[PDB]
């Protein structure tokens, strides 16, 4: 079975460098061209370069957006393809996929790795602030998890006992470099006076564990 | 550079229907150098069809392709539930290699207008000097909607961010939150805070508002 495992990703400050690795298995590595594709969060696929097999010159090709900044190499001894990334900026934040180029007349990307995430940010680790979205028949209530870094945070209601009607929105990246999200839930208006609702926010990168009680007002 | 424009942006169909995805190129490309990929949320893309008439190994027969020169088509003869995902076309006969912006194939359901709720900032956050006002559009379909913040009847611009959930796996609806963020000082020099919501299921825009200090 053809296997492609990406590694070497994670958090990196702007201007620094980072090298991504792609370990191949299940096929003859030296016979195939390899190609890197990245996907910015919430956007499409962008080709960021390929490298031919050494029997075809072993040279590379890069797009203008990363030319002079990204370098692709290969090590047929250990069946590893490398992506050397220099002068990383925040726009390079993406999931980077390692792909195998198919042989023949039509060189499509036949096999993909699971991808590795590379985050280019200068933000420091910060715990979130949890504020209640108090309810005023169906009433909506929720919790606001504001200003945290890095991702992610997990949100549950009543220690996981409340799952119906719960919507935890995807986080957004504010101009400050920190993340924010909301978790809402719809409940009957009658249950506000009796049933208690508590959102459980967890941010392990900062050891933040908050159990916030949301009451009407 | 050859630009691949996919249309439509979102295909709203149901299982059993036929799906026709288009991909137009800014320059004439050969069919041998055109490929289609499928990507489900949180998963790596996988190849479906490429070249003149090649299918990736293990791809069902309901996926087929055609087209010449500048207009190409990916056809799903009878949609299965696992076929609801995003599809990208790619050209690789011209440098640089380029992908299309992607076509989403989503589950079609009946129209459902958003239920709108507004939340003033909590007193705990106000004590820190920042006010976050949240507008919630819950369980609406289809996806297209417009949210506009009005502060003392003045349209806001550039001080809000939106977040939208994936299509719900049970009722096939979307939910959307819009957060208006301001300093406490700017928040306290205005009275009426409102988000105006427009949607094809509403005969007129729906406004939810609150007076600061009530």
């Amino acid at each position: 079975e053809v296997q492609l495992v990406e590694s070497g990703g994670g958090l990196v400050q702007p201007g620094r460098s980072l090298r991504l690795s792609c370990t191949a298995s299940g096929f003859t590595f030296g016979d195939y061209a390899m190609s890197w594709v990245r996907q910015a969060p919430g956007k499409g696929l962008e080709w960021v370069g390929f490298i031919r097999s050494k029997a075809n010159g072993g040279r590379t090709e890069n797009p203008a957006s990363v030319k002079g900044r990204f370098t692709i190499s290969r090590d047929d001894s250990k069946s590893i393809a490398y992506l050397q990334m220099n002068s990383l900026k925040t726009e390079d934040t993406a999931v980077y996929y390692c792909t195998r180029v198919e042989l023949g007349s039509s060189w499509s990307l036949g096999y993909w790795g699971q991808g590795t995430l590379v985050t280019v940010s200068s933000a420091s680790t910060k715990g979130p602030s949890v504020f209640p979205l108090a309810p005023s028949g169906t009433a909506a209530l929720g919790c606001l998890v504001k200003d945290y870094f890095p991702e992610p945070v997990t949100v549950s209601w009543n220690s996981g006992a409340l799952t119906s009607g719960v919507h935890t929105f995807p986080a957004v990246l504010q101009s400050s470099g920190l993340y924010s999200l909301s978790s809402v839930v719809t409940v009957p208006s009658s249950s506000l006076g009796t049933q208690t609702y508590i959102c459980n926010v967890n941010h392990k990168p900062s050891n933040t564990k908050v159990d916030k009680k949301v009451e009407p007002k | 550079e050859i630009v691949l424009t996919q249309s439509p942006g979102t295909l709203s169909l149901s299982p059993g229907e036929r799906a026709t995805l288009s991909c137009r190129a800014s320059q004439s490309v050969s069919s041998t150098y055109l490929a289609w990929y499928q990507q489900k949320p949180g998963q790596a893309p996988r190849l479906l069809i490429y070249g003149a008439s090649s299918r990736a190994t293990g791809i069902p027969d309901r996926f087929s392709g055609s087209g010449s020169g500048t207009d190409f088509t990916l056809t799903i003869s009878r949609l299965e539930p696992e076929d609801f995902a995003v599809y990208y076309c790619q050209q690789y006969g011209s440098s640089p290699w380029t992908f299309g912006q992607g076509t989403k194939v989503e589950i079609k359901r009946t129209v459902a207008a958003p239920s709108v709720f507004i939340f003033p900032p909590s007193d705990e956050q106000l004590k820190s000097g920042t006010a976050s006002v949240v507008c919630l559009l819950n369980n609406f379909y289809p996806r297209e909607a417009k949210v506009q913040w009005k502060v003392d009847n003045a349209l806001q611009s550039g001080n809000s961010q939106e977040s939208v959930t994936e299509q719900d796996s049970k009722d096939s609806t979307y939910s959307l939150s819009s957060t208006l963020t301001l300093s406490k000082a700017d928040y306290e020099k205005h009275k009426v805070y409102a988000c105006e919501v427009t949607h094809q299921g509403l005969s007129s825009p729906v406004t939810k508002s609150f007076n600061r200090g009530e």
Binding site: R59, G104 | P96
Partner: peptide
């Protein structure tokens, strides 16, 4: 006249 730089399976450098 296919673009040699786009082709990853054939050497662009001439004999």
């Amino acid at each position: 006249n296919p673009d040699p730089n786009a082709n990853p399976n054939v050497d662009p450098n001439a004999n």
